Paper text:
Cytochromes [name] superfamily (CYP) is a large and diverse group of enzymes containing a heme cofactor which participate in a variety of physiological roles including hormone and secondary metabolite biosynthesis, as well as xenobiotic metabolism. Until recently, six proteins were identified in the Thaxtomin A biosynthesis pathway: TxtA and TxtB are non-ribosomal peptide synthases; TxtC and [name] are CYPs; TxtD is a nitric oxide synthase that produces nitric oxide from L-arginine; TxtR is a cellobiose-responsive pathway specific activator. [name] catalyzes direct nitration of the indolyl moiety of L-tryptophan (L-Trp) to L-4-nitrotryptophan using nitric oxide, dioxygen and NADPH, which is the key step of Thaxtomin A biosynthesis. Although NO-related nitration is not an uncommon chemical process in organisms, particularly for tyrosine nitration, [name] is the first reported enzyme that catalyzes a direct nitration reaction specifically in a biosynthetic pathway and thus it can potentially be developed for industrial applications.
In this paper, we report the crystal structure of [name] in substrate-free form. Although gel filtration results show that [name] is a monomer in the solution, two molecules are found in the asymmetric unit. [name] presents a typical trigonal-prism like cytochrome [name] fold with a length of ~50 Å and a thickness of ~30 Å. The N-terminal His-tag, residues 1 of chain A, residues 1 - 4 of chain B, residues 175 - 183 and the last residue of both chains cannot be observed as there is no clear electron density for these residues. This structure also contains three imidazole molecules, two of which are coordinated with the iron atoms of heme. However, two B′ helices (B′1 and B′2) are separated by an inserted loop (residues 69 - 77). Two B′ helices together with B′2-C loop, F helix and G helix are located in the distal side of the heme, and are involved in substrate access and binding. In both molecules, the F-G loop (residues 175 - 183) is disordered. A clearly defined substrate access channel was observed between helix B′1 and helix G which can be classified as channel 2a according the common nomenclature. Interestingly, in the structure of [name] a continuous hydrogen bond chain from the active site to the external solvent is observed due to the I helix distortion. Compared with these two structures, [name] shows a unique proton transfer pathway which crosses the helix I distortion and is nearly parallel to the heme plane.
Author numbering: 2 to 174, 184 to 406
């Protein structure tokens, strides 16, 4: 019953040496407070994400872990939701649900999002007053860009932001019932939005393409589109994107050489998203459940037991990324990071987010190449969704 040096918040601002300590001896071990087997190496994490033996059907288990002794009946909104979205379903249902939303994520769509995001990022960074000298990059940039991308790339109506953001914030973090009510709000909003009963959806956006494709859907139901749209809203306004932006900004702030590498060579620019994502996973760990007994890292994981796959540790496994603690844009294989997961449930917005990141650093660094930290960066108290709460920055 030895507690794990994970679980405890003290490691959040810099969890990587701890990950290393543990990975040396105990790459797979029990975490008392997560009710789960933590797995830490790249090999076993990738294996975990690809394995048809671990199920994504994990709502009951994760909810147990997060709200002990507070079970929910199968017809409760949380369970219907989990049963009807890509995140918590296995093939073949998962594949049908995934195919039902591909209209927003085609090659052509991303061709458009590229231009849109170039624009948005440039306007954001250009909006910084010419004599600024100091900034907290978290509220000013990292928290702001995903919102603007949500409006102009995804198609969330601007006027509806004030409805959606507090509700996702509540969901992501008081009471389980309040969270359930907010999730219900997200479903009802998705439903009414598609019927034109809410804000105006800008054209050529994700939600516009999704809406136009509803009449052509044959394997899935309107209800399932509502569920998945609720999921989309949650991921859209989660701290994951701002966390990536801010952690990357901090990485550049502490690595001038990579700033000049960035400004000189287009290769570095094109690898920037992947290297930032590798250096700090916004989602430090994701969850699985063993459908059957699995043998991993020298451990017999029993059927029904929960697994915590530490993508953040895998991104800095020296077995896969030589000198993993270095922020390096010339790195050959940054694209092998697990920050977007891997295989079946690989992040639906991976390319959109990569575009957002790239253009953000292009715009930031073509105006402020002389960025430094001006005081200690402050991290949130959570490891699972790890992100900077404050990043004080001197621009000039
Ligand atoms: C659209 C909206 C959206 C956005 C914005 C996002 C953004 C993001 N994302 Fe995401 N995702 C998503 C949507 C999303 N997403 C979905 C829907 C999913 C599921 C898929 C499947 O399942 O198939 C994911 C998934 C996912 C995963 C996997 C998990 C598992 O497997 O379990 C990960 C790791 C991630 C991450 C992420 C990050 C880090 C970010 C920032 C940077 N993602």
């Amino acid at each position: 019953t030895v507690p794990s040096p994970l679980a405890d918040p003290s490691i959040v601002p810099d969890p990587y040496p701890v990950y290393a300590d543990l990975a040396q001896r105990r790459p797979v071990h029990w975490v008392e407070r997560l009710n789960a087997w933590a797995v830490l190496t790249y090999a076993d994490c990738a294996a975990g994400l690809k394995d048809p033996r671990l199920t994504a059907d994990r709502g009951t288990e994760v909810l147990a872990a997060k709200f002990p002794g507070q079970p929910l009946p199968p017809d409760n909104i949380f369970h219907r939701w989990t049963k009807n979205v890509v995140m918590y379903t296995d093939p073949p249902l998962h594949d049908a649900l995934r195919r039902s939303v591909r209209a927003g994520f085609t090659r052509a769509a991303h061709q458009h999002y590229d231009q849109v995001l170039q624009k948005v990022a440039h306007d954001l960074v250009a909006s910084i007053p010419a004599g600024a000298t100091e900034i907290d990059a978290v509220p000013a940039l990292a928290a702001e860009l995903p919102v603007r991308s949500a409006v102009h790339a995804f198609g969330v109506p601007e006027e509806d932001l004030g409805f959606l953001i507090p509700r996702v914030n509540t969901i992501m973090t008081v009471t389980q019932e309040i969270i359930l009510e907010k999730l219900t709000d997200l479903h009802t909003y998705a439903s009414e939005l598609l019927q034109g009963m809410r804000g105006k959806v800008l054209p050529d956006t994700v939600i516009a393409r999704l809406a136009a494709a509803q009449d052509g859907l044959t394997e899935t139901t309107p209800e399932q589109t509502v569920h998945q749209l609720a999921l989309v809203f949650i991921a859209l306004f989660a701290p994951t994107t701002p966390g990536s932006l801010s952690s990357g900004t901090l990485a550049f702030a502490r690595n001038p050489r990579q700033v000049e590498r960035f400004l000189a060579d287009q290769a570095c620019v094109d690898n920037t998203a992947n290297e930032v994502l590798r250096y700090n996973a916004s989602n430090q760990f994701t969850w699985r459940v063993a459908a059957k007994d699995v043998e991993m890292g020298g451990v017999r994981i029993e059927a029904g037991q929960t697994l915590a796959l530490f993508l953040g540790s895998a991104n800095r496994d020296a077995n896969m990324f030589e000198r993993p603690n270095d922020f390096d844009l010339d790195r050959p294989n940054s694209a092998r990071h697990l920050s977007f997961g891997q295989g079946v449930h690989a992040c639906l917005a991976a390319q959109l987010i990569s575009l957002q990141l790239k253009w953000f650093y292009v715009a930031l660094l073509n105006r402020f190449p002389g960025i430094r930290t001006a005081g200690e960066p402050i991290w949130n108290e959570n490891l699972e969704f790890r992100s900077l709460r404050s990043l004080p920055l001197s621009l000039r």
